[PDB]
Amino acid sequence: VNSFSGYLKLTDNVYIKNADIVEEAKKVKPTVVVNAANVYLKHGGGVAGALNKATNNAMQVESDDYIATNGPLKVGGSCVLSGHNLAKHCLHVVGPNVNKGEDIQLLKSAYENFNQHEVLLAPLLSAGIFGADPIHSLRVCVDTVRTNVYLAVFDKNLYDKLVSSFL
Numbered sequence: 001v002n003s004f005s006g007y008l009k010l011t012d013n014v015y016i017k018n019a020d021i022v023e024e025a026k027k028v029k030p031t032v033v034v035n036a037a038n039v040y041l042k043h044g045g046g047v048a049g050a051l052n053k054a055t056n057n058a059m060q061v062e063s064d065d066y067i068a069t070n071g072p073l074k075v076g077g078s079c080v081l082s083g084h085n086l087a088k089h090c091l092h093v094v095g096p097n098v099n100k101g102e103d104i105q106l107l108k109s110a111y112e113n114f115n116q117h118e119v120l121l122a123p124l125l126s127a128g129i130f131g132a133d134p135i136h137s138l139r140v141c142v143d144t145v146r147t148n149v150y151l152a153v154f155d156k157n158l159y160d161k162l163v164s165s166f167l
């Protein structure tokens with residue numbers, strides 16, 4: 001048993017809910033929240049800007065020290081940093097940004113990072129302002145992640161579309 005509530009079950013291991021990932025993290029305090037990061041860990045908008053704002057910018061301060069030491073992530077890569085006030089850990093995962101001309105084939109590599117964690121609260125990678133088709137992102141998630149993933153979709157209209165179209 002875990003503390004996640006109100007999720008639709010898609011598969012053996014994938015669950016989904018219409019909720020802001022920020023509001024879900026505050027309520028659950030999961031072991032791992034996934035950030036939809038970029039390679040610079042510059043948390044401007046989408047899930048990164050919203051998560052970072054909820055940490056009072058502590059996520060960005062920690063992230064800048066990480067980049068100063070290690071350099072940028074790879075597209076498709078990740079790093080584990082603090083979850084601050086939202087979670088034990090934040091897994092910063094870089095999905096391809098379609099709008100940036102980033103290769104969509106890297107989305108599977110991005111979701112493979114989730115398999116290093118038994119349970120995660122996560123957004124749909126490369127969706128929203130990263131420009132990918134969210135229906136595709138959900139399919140790659142279900143076909144790639146083997147650990148237990150609780151997906152938060154903030155947009156009501158997108159949630160209803162993802163559920164109705166899910167095979």
Ligand SMILES: Cc1nc(Cn2cnc(N)c3ncnc2-3)cs1
Nearest residue numbers: 020021036046050123127128154
């Ligand atoms: C770059 C990306 N944006 C989203 C959409 N999205 C944006 N803002 C939030 N606070 C969200 N919580 C859940 N999903 C959210 C997915 S990936």
